[PDB]
Each structure stands twice: as C-alpha cells, then as structure tokens.
Design an enzyme around this catalytic site. Sequence first.
Site, mmCIF file in Angstrom:
data_model
loop_
_atom_site.group_PDB
_atom_site.id
_atom_site.type_symbol
_atom_site.label_atom_id
_atom_site.label_comp_id
_atom_site.label_asym_id
_atom_site.label_seq_id
_atom_site.Cartn_x
_atom_site.Cartn_y
_atom_site.Cartn_z
ATOM 1 N N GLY A 131 7.537 4.446 3.432
ATOM 2 C CA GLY A 131 8.117 5.686 3.893
ATOM 3 C C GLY A 131 9.412 5.397 4.593
ATOM 4 N N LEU A 145 0.790 -1.251 0.000
ATOM 5 C CA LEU A 145 0.000 0.000 0.000
ATOM 6 C C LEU A 145 0.814 1.289 0.000
ATOM 7 C CD1 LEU A 145 -2.610 -1.168 2.675
ATOM 8 C CD2 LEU A 145 -2.908 -1.203 0.170
ATOM 9 N N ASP A 181 1.809 14.528 13.742
ATOM 10 C CA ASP A 181 1.916 14.341 12.286
ATOM 11 C C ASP A 181 0.535 14.356 11.651
ATOM 12 O OD1 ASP A 181 3.328 14.019 9.887
ATOM 13 O OD2 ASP A 181 3.593 11.853 10.168
ATOM 14 N N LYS A 210 2.010 -3.213 9.073
ATOM 15 C CA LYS A 210 3.051 -2.214 8.969
ATOM 16 C C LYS A 210 4.342 -2.802 9.466
ATOM 17 C CE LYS A 210 3.910 2.439 10.938
ATOM 18 N NZ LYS A 210 3.271 3.490 11.701
ATOM 19 N N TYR A 262 10.208 5.117 7.685
ATOM 20 C CA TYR A 262 10.219 4.248 8.870
ATOM 21 C C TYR A 262 9.488 2.914 8.709
ATOM 22 C CZ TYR A 262 11.838 8.418 11.409
ATOM 23 O OH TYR A 262 12.583 9.506 11.835
ATOM 24 N N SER A 263 8.793 2.698 7.596
ATOM 25 C CA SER A 263 7.920 1.527 7.509
ATOM 26 C C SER A 263 7.510 1.319 6.056
ATOM 27 C CB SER A 263 6.694 1.719 8.436
ATOM 28 O OG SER A 263 5.842 2.834 8.057
ATOM 29 N N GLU A 264 6.991 0.131 5.820
ATOM 30 C CA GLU A 264 6.146 -0.086 4.681
ATOM 31 C C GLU A 264 4.869 -0.829 5.118
ATOM 32 O OE1 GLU A 264 8.303 -2.705 1.886
ATOM 33 O OE2 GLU A 264 9.214 -0.883 1.038
ATOM 34 N N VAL A 265 3.822 -0.656 4.355
ATOM 35 C CA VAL A 265 2.517 -1.098 4.755
ATOM 36 C C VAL A 265 1.918 -1.967 3.662
ATOM 37 C CG1 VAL A 265 0.382 -0.243 5.435
ATOM 38 C CG2 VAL A 265 2.304 1.022 6.201
HETATM 39 O O1 LIG Z 1 13.475 3.152 -3.044
HETATM 40 C C1 LIG Z 1 14.478 3.349 -3.807
HETATM 41 O O2 LIG Z 1 14.825 2.391 -4.582
HETATM 42 C C2 LIG Z 1 15.224 4.722 -3.772
HETATM 43 C C3 LIG Z 1 14.507 5.872 -4.558
HETATM 44 N N1 LIG Z 1 13.684 6.733 -3.637
HETATM 45 C C4 LIG Z 1 13.458 8.209 -3.881
HETATM 46 O O3 LIG Z 1 13.937 8.770 -4.825
HETATM 47 C C5 LIG Z 1 12.576 9.041 -2.889
HETATM 48 C C6 LIG Z 1 13.389 9.632 -1.700
HETATM 49 C C7 LIG Z 1 14.869 10.121 -1.990
HETATM 50 O O4 LIG Z 1 15.144 11.193 -2.641
HETATM 51 O O5 LIG Z 1 15.861 9.456 -1.541
HETATM 52 N N2 LIG Z 1 11.487 8.110 -2.471
HETATM 53 C C8 LIG Z 1 10.252 7.977 -3.303
HETATM 54 O O6 LIG Z 1 10.130 8.642 -4.295
HETATM 55 C C9 LIG Z 1 9.154 6.938 -2.861
HETATM 56 C C10 LIG Z 1 9.314 5.650 -3.717
HETATM 57 C C11 LIG Z 1 9.875 4.423 -2.946
HETATM 58 O O7 LIG Z 1 11.109 4.426 -2.618
HETATM 59 O O8 LIG Z 1 9.101 3.424 -2.677
HETATM 60 N N3 LIG Z 1 7.721 7.351 -2.949
HETATM 61 C C12 LIG Z 1 6.730 6.426 -2.327
HETATM 62 O O9 LIG Z 1 7.123 5.422 -1.796
HETATM 63 C C13 LIG Z 1 5.201 6.662 -2.320
HETATM 64 C C14 LIG Z 1 4.390 5.351 -2.047
HETATM 65 C C15 LIG Z 1 2.898 5.682 -1.828
HETATM 66 C C16 LIG Z 1 1.861 4.548 -2.056
HETATM 67 C C17 LIG Z 1 1.606 4.269 -3.572
HETATM 68 C C18 LIG Z 1 0.152 3.785 -3.907
HETATM 69 C C19 LIG Z 1 0.031 2.285 -4.371
HETATM 70 C C20 LIG Z 1 -0.781 1.452 -3.345
HETATM 71 C C21 LIG Z 1 -2.330 1.723 -3.221
HETATM 72 C C22 LIG Z 1 -2.867 2.512 -1.972
HETATM 73 C C23 LIG Z 1 -4.293 3.020 -2.385
HETATM 74 N N4 LIG Z 1 -4.851 3.913 -1.355
HETATM 75 C C24 LIG Z 1 -4.783 5.395 -1.503
HETATM 76 C C25 LIG Z 1 -3.518 6.005 -0.911
HETATM 77 O O10 LIG Z 1 -2.917 5.276 -0.027
HETATM 78 O O11 LIG Z 1 -3.151 7.196 -1.300
HETATM 79 C C26 LIG Z 1 -5.558 3.369 -0.232
HETATM 80 O O12 LIG Z 1 -6.072 4.134 0.544
HETATM 81 C C27 LIG Z 1 -5.742 1.864 -0.161
HETATM 82 C C28 LIG Z 1 -6.471 1.514 1.101
HETATM 83 C C29 LIG Z 1 -5.588 1.631 2.314
HETATM 84 O O13 LIG Z 1 -4.438 1.921 2.346
HETATM 85 N N5 LIG Z 1 -6.281 1.345 3.498
HETATM 86 C C30 LIG Z 1 -5.668 1.447 4.764
HETATM 87 N N6 LIG Z 1 -6.280 1.121 5.829
HETATM 88 C C31 LIG Z 1 -5.519 1.332 6.926
HETATM 89 C C32 LIG Z 1 -4.199 1.711 6.753
HETATM 90 C C33 LIG Z 1 -3.211 2.004 7.727
HETATM 91 C C34 LIG Z 1 -3.385 1.836 9.115
HETATM 92 C C35 LIG Z 1 -2.423 2.307 9.989
HETATM 93 C C36 LIG Z 1 -1.193 2.801 9.573
HETATM 94 C C37 LIG Z 1 -0.202 3.357 10.540
HETATM 95 O O14 LIG Z 1 -0.662 3.576 11.732
HETATM 96 O O15 LIG Z 1 0.971 3.691 10.194
HETATM 97 C C38 LIG Z 1 -0.919 2.910 8.195
HETATM 98 C C39 LIG Z 1 -1.966 2.517 7.331
HETATM 99 S S1 LIG Z 1 -4.015 1.914 5.035
HETATM 100 C C40 LIG Z 1 13.669 5.288 -5.736
HETATM 101 O O16 LIG Z 1 12.406 5.057 -5.587
HETATM 102 O O17 LIG Z 1 14.263 5.022 -6.853
#
Ligand SMILES: O=C(O)C[C@H](NC(=O)[C@H](CC(=O)O)NC(=O)[C@H](CC(=O)O)NC(=O)CCCCCCCCCCCN(CC(=O)O)C(=O)CCC(=O)Nc1ncc(-c2ccc(C(=O)O)cc2)s1)C(=O)O
EC number: 2.7.11.1
Length: 328
Positions: free
Chosen positions: A43, A40, A151, A63, A45-48
């Site tokens: 970040g 999903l 947050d 998480k 600190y975690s992935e979900v």
């Molecule tokens: O990595 C590498 O290789 C290195 C490199 N990196 C970078 O360049 C930079 C940093 C830098 O400069 O260094 N980094 C990035 O660019 C990163 C890329 C990465 O690295 O991965 N960007 C991200 O990751 C963004 C990821 C976001 C999620 C993408 C969406 C796909 C999944 C579908 C979700 C759909 N949706 C809407 C939404 O979610 O919007 C939902 O709602 C679904 C329903 C849902 O969720 N229901 C929930 N119910 C309860 C939940 C919950 C309960 C508690 C908790 C908690 O209490 O915590 C949490 C959740 S959730 C590179 O990438 O090359």
Amino acid sequence: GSRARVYAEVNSLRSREYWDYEAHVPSWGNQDDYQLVRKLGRGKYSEVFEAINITNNERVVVKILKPVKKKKIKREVKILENLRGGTNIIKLIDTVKDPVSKTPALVFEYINNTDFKQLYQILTDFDIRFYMYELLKALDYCHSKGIMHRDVKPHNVMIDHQQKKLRLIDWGLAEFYHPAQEYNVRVASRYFKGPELLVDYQMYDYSLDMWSLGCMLASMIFRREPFFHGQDNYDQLVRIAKVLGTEELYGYLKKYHIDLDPHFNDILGQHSRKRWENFIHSENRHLVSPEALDLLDKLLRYDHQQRLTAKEAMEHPYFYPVVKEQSQ
Ligand SMILES: O=C(O)C[C@H](NC(=O)[C@H](CC(=O)O)NC(=O)[C@H](CC(=O)O)NC(=O)CCCCCCCCCCCN(CC(=O)O)C(=O)CCC(=O)Nc1ncc(-c2ccc(C(=O)O)cc2)s1)C(=O)O
Ligand SMILES: O=C(O)C[C@H](NC(=O)[C@H](CC(=O)O)NC(=O)[C@H](CC(=O)O)NC(=O)CCCCCCCCCCCN(CC(=O)O)C(=O)CCC(=O)Nc1ncc(-c2ccc(C(=O)O)cc2)s1)C(=O)O
Ligand SMILES: [Cl-]
C-alpha cells in the site's frame, strides 16, 4: 462531549509519556534475524511479507515502512506498545531495522486469514454475531486506552475461520483522543468514512470507529459489500443520505453548527429515510433478525454522540447467543 464518558479524558489522567509519541524512542533490532518468504500486500505506506524468525522458527509478518515523517512511525509504534496484550489486537512481536539501509520495520504474529470477499459469502447468523462481538472487544479495548483506530474496514480485520481467531490490524492511521482537539479528516477508506469526515467536521471521537463497524455489520447481514458504495467523497455522503434521509442530515448539521460544502447543493437531492427492513430478501433473510436491525439502527446514525459505544453494542441482545456460548 463524547458519548464514551468513562474514556473521554483518559489520556489526561495518564503520564505525558503515554501519549507524547514525538518524544518516544523505540528500541530497534536487526531485520537480519528474519527470513522473508513471500509478499502479502502493498500500500501507500508499507509492504508486508510472510517471514520466519531464524532463531526460533516462528512464522511472523514483517511490515516494511515506506518513507514518511519519523513522527508517524513513532505514533504507530507507541500505540502498539500501549495496546500490548489487548483483546483481539494484532500482537507486535518486534521493532527492527534493515542492517544496511536502516529502513524501519514492524514484526507481527501471522494469522491464517480468509479473504473477506470469500468469507463473507459463507457466514451463518451465529458466525456474524461471533465475529462482530470479537471485533467489538478490540474497539472497546483500544478506546479504553485512549486510541481511535480510524481505519476500520474488512481488509483490516484478519479472520482465521478454521481456528476462530480475529485480529484488528493496521494501526498506521490511529491517534490519541483528547476532548475538543481538531483532527485531520483524511482518514478511513471511502466506504467506511463517517458523515462527520465527509462534511469536514474535525472534532470527532471514538464514535468514528463505531460508524465503520456499523457499515461492516450492514454488509454482513445484508450481503451487500461495501454497503455504501460511493464513487468519490461527495457521492459517498449522497449514498448515506439516500438511506438515512436528507432532513435528518440537516438536523445533524444544525446541531453541531456544521457548514456544508456548496457543491453538495448540486447532488444531495431530497430523500426520505428508508426502513431497514427494505434491505431484506430471500438471499439474506436467514441472517436478519429484529435484534440485528435494532443494533444496526443504533450504529448507523448521523449524530456521533447518539451512536452506541463499543461496550453498549456488546451489551445488546443481538449478542446474547454468543455470550451464552462463551460462558457455557
Ligand atoms: O507499483 C507500480 O509499479 C505502479 C502501479 N500502481 C497502480 O496503478 C495503483 C495506484 C495508482 O493509480 O497509482 N496501485 C495498485 O494497483 C496496487 C499494485 C501495486 O503497486 O503493488 N494494488 C495492490 O498492491 C494490491 C496488493 C494486495 C495483496 C495481493 C495478494 C497476494 C498475496 C497473498 C495474501 C493472501 N491473503 C488474503 C488477503 O490478504 O486478501 C492472506 O490473508 C494471507 C495471510 C496473511 O496475510 N496473514 C496476515 N497475518 C497478519 C498480517 C498483518 C499484521 C499486521 C499488519 C499491520 O498492522 O499493518 C498487516 C498485516 S497479514 C502499477 O502497479 O503498475
Ligand atoms: O477546565 C479547566 O479550566 C482546565 C482544563 N484542564 C484540566 O482540567 C486538566 C488538568 C489536569 O488534569 O491536571 N488538564 C487537561 O485536561 C490537559 C488539557 C488542557 O488543560 O488544555 N490535558 C492534556 O494536556 C492531555 C493532552 C492529550 C493529548 C493527546 C495527543 C493528541 C495529538 C493529536 C494530533 C492530531 N493531529 C494528527 C491527526 O489527526 O492525524 C492533527 O493533525 C491535528 C491538527 C494540527 O496539527 N493543527 C495545528 N498544528 C500546528 C499548529 C500550529 C503550531 C504552532 C504554531 C506556532 O508556532 O505559532 C502555529 C500553529 S495548529 C481544560 O481542559 O481547560
Ligand atoms: Cl467506545
């Protein structure tokens, strides 16, 4: 002291074990009881993941916590345990470890969320009043339990717009409040940081969350998201000052004996306070009322002791239509 007088000293009135998270010993189950289905989010600190509990077929979220000090894991777990059953707080179902690496993970209820960038474009006046009132319940609850979330932002508010369910998520930066404690100011997303954080004032309180809530309310009623869109932490304060005014900032700093980073001298300029009515136009007029503007004005204030508490915001006339429906 904190405007929330009834909540200021609560942690001092509880057992030490309630807040002493360094000493907390979680009970860890087995992640092998859950089947991961899809990723999903990710970040620092975690992935979900979406998952299924294999023993009862329930859909849940797992998480998986990235490596950090064990102290920060204990903090998030103890906070969630203390918030058990709280209104509109995401439900913690389990605390588990992987059966081979022993990596810790937190298991939550699943919410059928609509991403906020889509949702916020379709909300009615009533819908904004409803969802804000439901978010305020969660902040009044956690503040009453002695906890600052630190947050608050749209990504951390899950909204099922079909079933009308709201949950406040991601308690990983949350911390216990104690009067006169100096806190780390490196909390909140840039756009939702209170002026206190931006000027390095460490003796903040629950009212930090009420600034972030006000930023959300402004973005919803005015359809400008995020409302204050800084390019970095310096520019963030400048964007606030272009709305609330520079003379008003200086009165706040003087009251609390706050020293301003000298780099701000080169960028703040001079700005009058703007009237909130200046943000109204044909695309948002149906979402703005005198009651909305009066509430917003009482949230987005420099002086953290003058911002409404969550309960005072709930008592505001802006929410009278929602209270009427909930008692009818
Ligand atoms: O990595 C590498 O290789 C290195 C490199 N990196 C970078 O360049 C930079 C940093 C830098 O400069 O260094 N980094 C990035 O660019 C990163 C890329 C990465 O690295 O991965 N960007 C991200 O990751 C963004 C990821 C976001 C999620 C993408 C969406 C796909 C999944 C579908 C979700 C759909 N949706 C809407 C939404 O979610 O919007 C939902 O709602 C679904 C329903 C849902 O969720 N229901 C929930 N119910 C309860 C939940 C919950 C309960 C508690 C908790 C908690 O209490 O915590 C949490 C959740 S959730 C590179 O990438 O090359
Ligand atoms: O009126 C009077 O006369 C008496 C009066 N009392 C009373 O009336 C009552 C009497 C009663 O009820 O029985 N009692 C109380 O109310 C007492 C207080 C007191 O009495 O004092 N209440 C308590 O105890 C309750 C305490 C609740 C605490 C809740 C947990 C808070 C944790 C915050 C962590 C914040 N975070 C993390 C983040 O922000 O993420 C930071 O990072 C902080 C920055 C940081 O870590 N900084 C430093 N780190 C290390 C340092 C350091 C360490 C060691 C050494 C060394 O080894 O040398 C050197 C430096 S410095 C009264 O209050 O005066
Ligand atoms: Cl409050």
